[PDB]
Amino acid sequence: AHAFWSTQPVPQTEDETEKIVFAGPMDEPKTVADIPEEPYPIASTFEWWTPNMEAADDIHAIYELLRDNYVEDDDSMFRFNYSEEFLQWALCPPNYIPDWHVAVRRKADKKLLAFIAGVPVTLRMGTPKYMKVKAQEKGEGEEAAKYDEPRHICEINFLCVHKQLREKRLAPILIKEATRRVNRTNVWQAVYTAGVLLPTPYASGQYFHRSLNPEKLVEIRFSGIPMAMLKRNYQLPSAPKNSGLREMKPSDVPQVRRILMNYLDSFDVGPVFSDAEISHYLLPRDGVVFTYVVENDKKVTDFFSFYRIPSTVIGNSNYNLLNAAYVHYYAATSIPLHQLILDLLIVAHSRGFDVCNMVEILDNRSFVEQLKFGAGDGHLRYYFYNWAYPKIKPSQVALVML
Ligand SMILES: CCCCCCCCCCCCCC(=O)SCCNC(=O)CCNC(=O)[C@H](O)C(C)(C)COP(=O)(O)OP(=O)(O)OC[C@H]1O[C@@H](n2cnc3c(N)ncnc32)[C@H](O)[C@@H]1OP(=O)(O)O
Numbered sequence: 001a002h003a004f005w006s007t008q009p010v011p012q013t014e015d016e017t018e019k020i021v022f023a024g025p026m027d028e029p030k031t032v033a034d035i036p037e038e039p040y041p042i043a044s045t046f047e048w049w050t051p052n053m054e055a056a057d058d059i060h061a062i063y064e065l066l067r068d069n070y071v072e073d074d075d076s077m078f079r080f081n082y083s084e085e086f087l088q089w090a091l092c093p094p095n096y097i098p099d100w101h102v103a104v105r106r107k108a109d110k111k112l113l114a115f116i117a118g119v120p121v122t123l124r125m126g127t128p129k130y131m132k133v134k135a136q137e138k139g140e141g142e143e144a145a146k147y148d149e150p151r152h153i154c155e156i157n158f159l160c161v162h163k164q165l166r167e168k169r170l171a172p173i174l175i176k177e178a179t180r181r182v183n184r185t186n187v188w189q190a191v192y193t194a195g196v197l198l199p200t201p202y203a204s205g206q207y208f209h210r211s212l213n214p215e216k217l218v219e220i221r222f223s224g225i226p227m228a229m230l231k232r233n234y235q236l237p238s239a240p241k242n243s244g245l246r247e248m249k250p251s252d253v254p255q256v257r258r259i260l261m262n263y264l265d266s267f268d269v270g271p272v273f274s275d276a277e278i279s280h281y282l283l284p285r286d287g288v289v290f291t292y293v294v295e296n297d298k299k300v301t302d303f304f305s306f307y308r309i310p311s312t313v314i315g316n317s318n319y320n321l322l323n324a325a326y327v328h329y330y331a332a333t334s335i336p337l338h339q340l341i342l343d344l345l346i347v348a349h350s351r352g353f354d355v356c357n358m359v360e361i362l363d364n365r366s367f368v369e370q371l372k373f374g375a376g377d378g379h380l381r382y383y384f385y386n387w388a389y390p391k392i393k394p395s396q397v398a399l400v401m402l
Pocket residue numbers: 001002003004005006069070071072154156157158159160161162165166167168169170171172175178179182183187188189190192193194195196198385386
């Protein structure tokens with residue numbers, strides 16, 4: 001059984017979620033007034049802390065916790081090493097809610113012991129297309145469309161319990177207190193992803209990896225194999241191919257918004273961004289996010305973005321860090337996607353990245369073979385809290401998780 005997740009308003013089995021035909025809430029309907037104003041009880045040796053994620057020193061403390069105690073691969077060879085500048089960026093988008101950033105500290109020495117963050121996101125999460133077709137067949141269109149409006153919900157990430165406190169049931173308490181703070185803000189859904197299987201994902205996709213520095217990837221034992229031929233296989237132009245590719249600037253915001261919103265529209269689950277959220281999530285930030293538009297005749301017709309997450313290489317001597325670029329949002333209207341993403345690779349490689357990672361969401365599958373991405377061991381499972389949702393393919397997901 002799941003002593004925690006069984007008590008939660010999520011579908012409980014694969015079986016249950018094959019049964020779901022309409023999008024909609026699961027729990028009893030509640031009001032802010034129904035929600036306790038006191039934080040969830042925790043042991044007297046601990047205290048709740050709300051870090052200030054725009055304070056360098058508080059960001060550094062979260063940083064160290066995640067550097068030492070966040071997500072590893074199944075073989076404990078790699079561990080995410082999210083940068084401080086990246087943490088500020090991911091956790092402080094426009095209209096972020098400081099109270100959604102939730103820590104536990106040892107009351108004695110203020111040692112940071114645990115963390116979970118929520119940020120606001122406006123998400124389209126109405127009944128998916130294949131199920132609206134069935135609803136129409138059965139004269140149930142209105143029930144199917146009832147929750148079509150884009151919803152203001154919580155996106156959770158960065159759940160982390162210090163290694164020294166593992167399997168002590170501290171993660172359920174963090175999730176309950178996060179849930180409480182979010183509910184007190186009159187928000188009743190969340191979206192989150194995990195590499196592990198929990199009850200119960202609405203979508204799952206494989207990760208894909210494109211080697212940019214195979215010598216290094218082999219050396220750290222991420223890849224296997226002659227090195228001259230492997231280098232030759234993965235070699236890339238030294239400069240981008242699309243004439244008038246350039247980094248995004250602030251005046252591109254409205255057109256990038258337009259073409260992104262038009263594109264993400266075609267997917268069942270996807271975010272809606274204001275101009276302020278496009279500027280936050282897509283304007284270039286050194287070491288963090290990198291975004292390039294195609295502009296021809298003073299008009300932005302395509303773009304791509306990727307973000308950086310270095311990983312600690314745990315076992316190797318010769319290297320302590322892996323530099324990885326993650327495919328972020330993009331849109332193509334003037335060139336095949338593979339031609340657009342080729343430039344992403346050239347740019348990533350030119351800037352010193354070792355590998356380009358993505359999950360098979362969006363139309364990421366459409367360029368896998370031609371650009372030489374290979375399937376990895378990772379899977380990313382997508383979940384909602386308090387939201388019934390029919391199983392969809394990952395190529396119907398348009399929400400990139402950081
Ligand atoms: C309305 C708004 C709602 C807001 C909240 C929305 C929900 C958000 C949900 C969180 C979204 C997070 C998205 C990400 O950030 S996914 C990345 C999570 N982080 C890591 O994997 C870092 C390395 N690992 C750790 O820090 C710990 O092992 C964690 C903290 C993950 C578990 O700590 P620990 O190992 O010390 O265990 P425990 O004894 O305290 O707790 C055991 C219980 O925890 C359940 N568990 C294990 N892994 C996960 C997991 N990734 N999501 C949710 N639950 C998980 C597990 O099944 C068990 O419950 P049950 O099986 O007994 O029933």
